[PDB]
Design a protein around this ligand. Sequence first.
Ligand SMILES: [Zn+2]
Ligand SMILES: [Zn+2]
Lengths: 87, 138, 114, 134, 195, 147, 134
Amino acid sequence: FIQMSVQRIVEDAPPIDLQAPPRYLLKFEQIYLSKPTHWERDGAPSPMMPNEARLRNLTYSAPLYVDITKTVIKEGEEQLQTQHQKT
Amino acid sequence: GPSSQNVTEYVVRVPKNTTKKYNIMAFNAADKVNFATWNQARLERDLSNKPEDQPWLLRVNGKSGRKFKGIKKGGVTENTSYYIFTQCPDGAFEAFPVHNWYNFTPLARHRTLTAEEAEEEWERRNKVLNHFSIMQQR
Amino acid sequence: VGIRFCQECNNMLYPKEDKENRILLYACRNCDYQQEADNSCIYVNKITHEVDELTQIIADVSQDPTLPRTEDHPCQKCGHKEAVFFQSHSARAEDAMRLYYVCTAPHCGHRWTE
Amino acid sequence: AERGELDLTGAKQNTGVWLVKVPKYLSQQWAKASGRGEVGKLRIAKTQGRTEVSFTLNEDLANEHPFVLQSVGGQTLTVFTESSSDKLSLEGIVVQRAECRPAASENYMRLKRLQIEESSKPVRLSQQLDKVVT
Amino acid sequence: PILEFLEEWSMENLEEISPAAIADATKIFVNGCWVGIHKDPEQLMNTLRKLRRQMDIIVSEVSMIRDIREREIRIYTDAGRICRPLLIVEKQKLLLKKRHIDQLKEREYNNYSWQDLVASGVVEYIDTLEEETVMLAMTPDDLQEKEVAYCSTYTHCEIHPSMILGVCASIIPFPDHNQSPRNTYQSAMGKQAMG
Amino acid sequence: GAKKSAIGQRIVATLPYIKQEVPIIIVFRALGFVSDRDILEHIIYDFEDPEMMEMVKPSLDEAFVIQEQNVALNFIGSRGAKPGVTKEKRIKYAKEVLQKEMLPHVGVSDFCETKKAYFLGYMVHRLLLAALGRRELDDRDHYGNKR
Amino acid sequence: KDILCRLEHTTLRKVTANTAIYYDPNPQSTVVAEDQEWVNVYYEMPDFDVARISPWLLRVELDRKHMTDRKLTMEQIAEKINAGFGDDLNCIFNDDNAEKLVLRIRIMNSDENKMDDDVFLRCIESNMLTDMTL
Ligand SMILES: [Zn+2]
Ligand SMILES: [Zn+2]
C-alpha cells in the first residue's frame, strides 16, 4: 500500500485544472514518506518510538509529502511552471 | 518433381515511410461477403457523433448494396506488430505496418420500429401474438 | 430442430406455411425474406434427453492428473492399456454412477462406456 | 469518381497478401535500421507433403524465425490504404496468415526479463526520507 | 508482464478472432478478464508453470488454473488470494533432494534461505483455485512409494500435514487423538491462558 | 401461461443504475450487435448444439421489438438513474452506463464494446450451461471464489 | 400397488419419451415409413376427420418402461386427451405391439375449415405434458 498503492492513487488522480483568462494546472508527481515523527509543543520534530506512542497516547504516523507541479497559462503565450517539492 | 523439394527464398524490405497508411479491414466469415458484386464502394466517416477518433462507415453500391459500419479495435498492439507481405516483380517481400484495425459489420436495410413506436409494442410485453404480423402493420 | 438465419439481415428464421403451396417455409420477421424448409420438423422436445455423454466428454481430460487411471480397460481403437475413467456428474440425469473411459494415449482421444 | 469512393482495382486483380504477426524485438530492430533497404530474407521450403516457412534475421541487423501458418477460412481479411491525397484504395485480399516465433527457448526469457524491467522502469513508487522535511 | 507474454505466445487476441474459432480453443482469463483464446492449452500451461517455478516473468503468488473440462485457463494476480507452499512432485519424485536439505541445514553463514527453494523450483505456492487441479500427496514417504495402485500422477506434496493448524491449534499436543470440538475449545482457551 | 410456458424461460440483465431488469438481448443491441447471428455468436460458440440454441430463443422474442442499437440505448436510458428529459439525453446516459458502469473491469473506454459483448455473452453462456445442467453451480463457500 | 398408481399423480410428461412437431402436409405420407405402417389403417376408413384436418402434426413418443410401470394404456390416454380437449384435437395412436409407442395429435377440422397454427400446437404440447392429468 505505501510503496505502490499510495503512489498509484496520487498518480492516477487527474490533474486539477482551474479556469476563471488565466489557467492553472496542478499535478502531483512523487510521494515522499519520512520516519514516524512527533512534534513537541515547541514545534521541534523528533523520531517517534513505538513505546513512546503507547505511553503518551500518540498515533504512530509518518509525515506524507508530495511533489506538486504548478503550471499557469495567462493567455499571453507564456507558460510559467513551478514545482513545490515535498508538499 | 521440383515441387516435391522446391525451395524459395525472398528478401524482406521495410521502407521507412509510405505516403499511404495501411489499415486492416475485417468481415465476418458467416457474413459471406462477395467482392465480385462490389461494383462501387464508398467509405466515409460516420455522422452519428455530430473525425479521426470516430468509427468508420462503409457503403457498397450506394443504397442498393450492403452497408457496413467500421469500428476501430479497442486493443492496443503495444507489445505486438502486424505487417502485410505483398508479392512484387522484384521478388523481395515488403512489410508495411498496419496503422489501425477495423471491424466492419453489415447493417440491415428494412423498416425498423421507431423508438417511440417501440413503446407502443412494449404494452404487449409477453401477450404478443403472431410475431410475424408485427412487421405487417409497419 | 435446426436453426437458420436469413441471408439478408442474418436474423432468426422462423417457420411458416403457405396456403397456396402447402409447403413449410422459413420466414424472417424483420426482413420479409423466405426460404424453403427441408427439415420439415419445427422442433423436437426430448423429455428424457438421453444425450450420449461421450459426445459431451472432452478428449483433453486425459491430461487431468486428478482423474484416476486404469490399465485394465485398453483403448478399443489404438489398444493403449492405460485409460482414464470418471463419472458424468451432469445434472438432469437423475442418476449417474457409470464410468466414462477416455484413452490416455496422446492424439487418440477415444472415449467409450463399459 | 468521388472523394468518398473507394478504389477496388486491387480486389479486381485478386491480389494476394500475407498477414504476419511479429514480436517487438524483430519490429524494433527494423525500426532501428530506419529502413536502410533490407532487414532480412524469408525462406520457404516445400516438401512432398509439407511446407516450411522461416525468416532469417540480417547479420548486420543483429549486431532463425520460423513461421507458423494459420487457417484463413475463419475470416476474410482485406487491406485498404488511406493515401495522404485523400484517395482511399483497396490494396488486396489477405490469402494467408502466419505468426513469427523466437527460436530461443530459455535464453529468450532473459531478454523478456530486461524488457519487463524496461517496461517497469517508469513505474514510480514511494520513497523513504531519513529526515522530516522542514 | 503476463499479458505481454501471452501476446508473445501463440495466443489469439479476442478482438481479432472469429466467434467460430472459440469452440475448439480454450478461453484465457487473466484476473477475470477474457483476454483471448489458445489452441494449445497444455503447452501454454507447462510454459506458464515453468516460468513461475523459475520466477522469470510470473511471480510466485500468481495462480494458473486450467479447467480442462471447461476449456478455460484462468490466471489470477490480484491480492487477497490465500495460498500455501507445496512441494513440487515430478514423476512420483520430490524435486526436493538431500542437497537442498543440507544447504538449508546451514541456513546461516550460507545465504541459503527459503526463497532459494522457491527459486530452485522445488516448492511453489498454490492457491485454493489451483488446488482443485492439483493432485497432492500427504507425505512422500508413503504416497509416492510404489504400492497398491491408487494414484500414479501426483503433482504436489505436503511439507507436513500438521501445518493445517493455526497458531492456537498448533499448541495442542496429540490433537489428532481428541474429539474435534475439544480442539476448538482449547483454541479459545489458549487465548485466555496467563503467562 | 400459453405464451410464457411455450417460449420457456427468458434471460434478463440487472445493470447498475437501472431500476428494472433489462432483457439480455437488448443490452447486446445497445452494444452494437443487432443481428441475431452476431449476438448468438458471442453467446453460443457452437451453433451445432441445438439444446443451447433453444434456450436463447425466448430471450430473442422478448427483444424482437428493438432492432436498432439507438432504440436499445434509448430503452436502457429510460430506466436510468434519473429520468431523461429528451431521447438524446436518454441515449447518451445509456451509453455512459454501458461504457463504464457496465463490466468496468472488462473495459472503461469507448472501444470496449466488443470486449464487453464477449464477456457478457460468456456470462450468458455460463448461465445457459448451469440451466442446461452441463456446468455445476458455483459454491459461495468455495474460497477460490473468495478474497 | 394398484392403489399406489391410483393416487400418485401422473402427467403426460412422466411417460413421454419426446415430442416433435412436423409440418406434415400430406397425412398419408406423414413423416417416415414408420408412421406409414399404421397411420394408413386409421386413414383407410377414418371418421370424424374426413371433412378437414390441421396441417401441423404433433407426434408424441411414450416410454414403454414408464407406461408399463404405471400400467397405462394408449386408448386410455387418447380418451383422457379427448376428454380434456373434446373434439378440439384428433388423437391417433399405434398398437401396443409395436416396439415404439406413438400418438399423433392435430387440431379440430372446423377451425381448419387467430394467434397461429404452429405456436398454438406448441402451447398444447406444453399444456398436455404438465397440466393434463393422466
Ligand atoms: Zn432478415
Ligand atoms: Zn487409444
